[PDB]
Design a protein around this ligand. Structure first.
Ligand SMILES: CC1=C2C[C@H]3[C@@H](CC=C4C[C@@H](O)CC[C@@]43C)[C@@H]2CC[C@]12O[C@@H]1C[C@H](C)CN[C@H]1[C@H]2C
Length: 117
């Protein structure tokens, strides 16, 4: 569905690349490059190397937050939508040409299901 069974843990940080998150629990299961919130914070630091291109940086940040620090509640996590995923393809093409999107950040419907509420 638009949710995935997981383990909820309390957010280590209330902040995701400049934005305050209106929830308290999260999970790392969507970010398949991170096995803890420490590594999540690490990989987000690396993602911050993109803020020299405000074009992509303004687009990719909701995506990064939705994937790396998603809202968890009752053993499930909110999955990022196809709509959100698609909006980053063009303005963040620099990511694709210089190293390439990780598989969990590519716009397949398994990671980013269409028609989410
Ligand atoms: C910021 C940046 C990126 C960090 C991203 C990478 C996509 C995938 C991952 C995997 C993820 O686990 C960690 C973050 C990482 C490495 C993306 C590629 C483009 C760029 O790398 C260039 C380096 C260059 C020196 C300057 N310009 C830099 C930027 C255009």
């Amino acid at each position: 569905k638009c949710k995935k069974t997981t383990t909820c843990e309390p957010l280590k940080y209330n902040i995701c690349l400049g934005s305050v998150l209106p929830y308290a629990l999260t999970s790392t299961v969507l970010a398949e490059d991170s096995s803890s919130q420490d590594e999540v914070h690490d990989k987000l630091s690396l993602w911050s190397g993109l803020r020299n291109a405000p074009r992509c940086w303004d687009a990719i940040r909701p995506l990064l937050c939705a994937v790396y620090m998603p809202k968890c509640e009752g053993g499930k996590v909110e999955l990022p939508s196809q709509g959100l995923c698609q909006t980053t393809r063009v303005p963040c093409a620099i990511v694709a040409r210089e190293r390439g999107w990780p598989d969990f950040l590519k716009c397949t419907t398994d990671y980013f299901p269409e028609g989410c509420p």
